[PDB]
Design a protein around this ligand. Structure first.
Ligand code: HEM
Ligand code: HEM
Ligand SMILES: *[C@@H]1O[C@H](CO)[C@@H](O)[C@H](O)[C@H]1NC(C)=O
Ligand SMILES: *[C@@H]1O[C@H](CO)[C@@H](O)[C@H](O)[C@H]1NC(C)=O
Ligand SMILES: *[C@@H]1O[C@H](CO)[C@@H](O)[C@H](O)[C@H]1NC(C)=O
Ligand SMILES: *[C@@H]1O[C@H](CO)[C@@H](O)[C@H](O)[C@H]1NC(C)=O
Ligand SMILES: *[C@@H]1O[C@H](CO)[C@@H](O)[C@H](O)[C@H]1NC(C)=O
Ligand SMILES: CCCCCCCCCCCC(=O)O
Ligand SMILES: CCCCCCCCCCCC(=O)O
Ligand SMILES: CCCCCCCCCCCC(=O)O
Ligand SMILES: [Mg+2]
Ligand SMILES: [Mg+2]
Lengths: 240, 240
């Protein structure tokens, strides 16, 4: 009963709220979430992620309610609210700069180069390439950001995000933990579902049982180590 | 204008969900929240706290959305869900036991003795008595619970809770940070608004600007120090 032809991609206008998350931004750009990116609740996110990507309520409720903390409203956010550093938003992003040394909100092609150039010799990104990218992005933050934060929690969130692009933008079974570069690149660079390019919503549900072993393997292959205090404390609201 | 005659106290039935919070339990017991204690949203908490206690949306949105993390639902909790240790629920409670060594959910008269016996020779509890109680309760946990968690965050939450009973159950201006023992005792022991005893909803709004100096003073007088790592990390959801 979901009609993708009734969900065309449209570029956001200058006052349409967009955040640091390509997943939610893409849903908004197709009208699965409000195109203005505002007044978004967790039930709305659950429905949009199901309809758009076949992502299940388990992960979207867990992440969604943490995301709600970033606004001043009782039960909604704007997508831009999610840029709040140290709730979910973190250093060593795949396509954004660290907030201490740049723009933690907008897609940045220079940052994205690392991901774009990963898995040489193949037309997919996969678990080993995803891990290499995480290793390299963290190394970049440690090199260049004097305020870098790197904890078990940020590392887990980062692997979760890599698992998302490998699964949601997959061509075959999302279980395989690989996704066409052509699909993933459109997802990040244009925050668009690559429909003309051949992408289709997964027919396999993407939930925590599916993602968990992928996340853990990405972490394992990334050669991640604690670097500092390692306290997994999140920011509980804006303006504290 | 709030009609308290239309909000009578009724004892919870066997299937009514109740949690570790006397504030929310009392609102449920008067039907300001659903008497069954289920499917409770942050907007419902905001409205109930305003109507019942004149507590404003600043504190209830902030605390409410953190409380939402304790359930598996998109935008509601059951009151019992709030017992989840390490989200809001903490050791050295005023009226509950530490989860590692007892029941962190139900009112416990033996624990409550410390509060009940505080401020000898006055008919109010006040900021100095509240601080002494927090000191003594923490000392008890440090003595008897080898797994005690005691951090900047838990200390702040604890002082916030003491500030709540001093203000919401006040007779005079809540600014004064003192409340009749007869009112506070009914609040904890029966999770009832002490209307027959003479209590009335504050005509002064109770918000973060009002609570903040009370919180800080309680902490200052309590001779507080952190335990161990002093890591302000919360549990982000159940079953992790
Ligand atoms: C469930 C609700 C969601 C919330 C609240 C959320 C929130 C966020 C936030 C705050 C970030 C920024 C982290 C950072 O890079 O600093 C982010 C990144 C990301 N999210 Fe989401 N997200 C959600 C769902 C999704 C979904 C459904 C996808 C699907 C593919 C997704 C894919 C991503 C990816 C790939 C990134 C990494 C961007 C980068 O590192 O540059 N997210 N998310
Ligand atoms: C006017 C509103 C409220 C009042 C007056 C109030 C009052 C209190 C008090 C006095 C305690 C301490 C109980 C003790 O130490 O034995 C407490 C504990 C608690 N409250 Fe509230 N509360 C209010 C709102 C909230 C809200 C909105 C939430 C979350 C949605 C919440 C969650 C809790 C939790 C989880 C505890 C347990 C902490 C612990 O003792 O371990 N409260 N509350
Ligand atoms: C936000 O959404 C709620 C729920 O649908 C609605 O009642 C409210 O009017 C909306 N506000 C705006 C500004 O659109
Ligand atoms: C990822 O693809 C590369 C190149 O095809 C391959 O060498 C590597 O084994 C793959 N890793 C996984 C986990 O499939
Ligand atoms: C960031 O690091 C610099 C250099 O160490 C330091 O002066 C500054 O206080 C830090 N800022 C934050 C946000 O901690
Ligand atoms: C209400 O909470 C119950 C658990 O108490 C949960 O099963 C249900 O999905 C929630 N939703 C509704 C429809 O009330
Ligand atoms: C609390 O009451 C006691 C006894 O009346 C008094 O000694 C003490 O100074 C009071 N403290 C405050 C903060 O008012
Ligand atoms: C296995 C744990 C995954 C959930 C981590 C906490 C919530 C953050 C959501 C991660 C997804 C995202 O950030 O896009
Ligand atoms: C300013 C840091 C506090 C962050 C919010 C956590 C919960 C606030 C405590 C509210 C009182 C209560 O738990 O009943
Ligand atoms: C319930 C905890 C929330 C905040 C507790 C610590 C700060 C005191 C209140 C904030 C005062 C203010 O700046 O308006
Ligand atoms: Mg980031
Ligand atoms: Mg407790």
């Amino acid at each position: 009963a979901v009609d993708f032809s009734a969900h065309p991609w449209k570029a956001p206008g200058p006052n349409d709220s967009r955040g640091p998350c390509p997943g939610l931004n893409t849903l908004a750009n197709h009208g699965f979430l409000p195109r203005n990116g505002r007044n978004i609740s967790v039930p709305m996110i659950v429905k949009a992620g199901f309809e758009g990507y076949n992502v299940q309520s388990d992960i979207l409720i867990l992440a969604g309610k943490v995301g709600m903390l970033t606004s001043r409203e009782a039960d909604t956010i704007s997508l831009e609210d999610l840029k709040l550093h140290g709730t979910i938003e973190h250093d060593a992003s795949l396509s954004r700069e660290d907030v201490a040394i740049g723009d933690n909100l907008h897609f940045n092609e220079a940052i994205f180069t690392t991901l774009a150039n990963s898995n040489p010799g193949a037309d997919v990104y996969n678990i080993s390439s995803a891990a290499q990218v995480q290793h390299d992005r963290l190394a970049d933050s440690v090199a260049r950001n004097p305020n870098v934060t790197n904890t078990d929690l940020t590392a887990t969130i980062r692997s979760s995000e890599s698992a998302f692009y490998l699964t949601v933008m997959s061509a075959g079974d999302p279980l395989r933990g690989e996704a066409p570069k052509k699909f993933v690149n459109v997802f990040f660079q244009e925050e668009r579902m690559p429909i003309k390019e051949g992408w289709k919503r997964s027919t396999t549900p993407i939930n925590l049982p599916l993602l968990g072993p992928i996340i853990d393997r990405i972490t394992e292959l990334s050669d991640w180590k604690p670097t500092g205090d390692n306290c997994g404390a999140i920011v509980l609201g804006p303006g504290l």
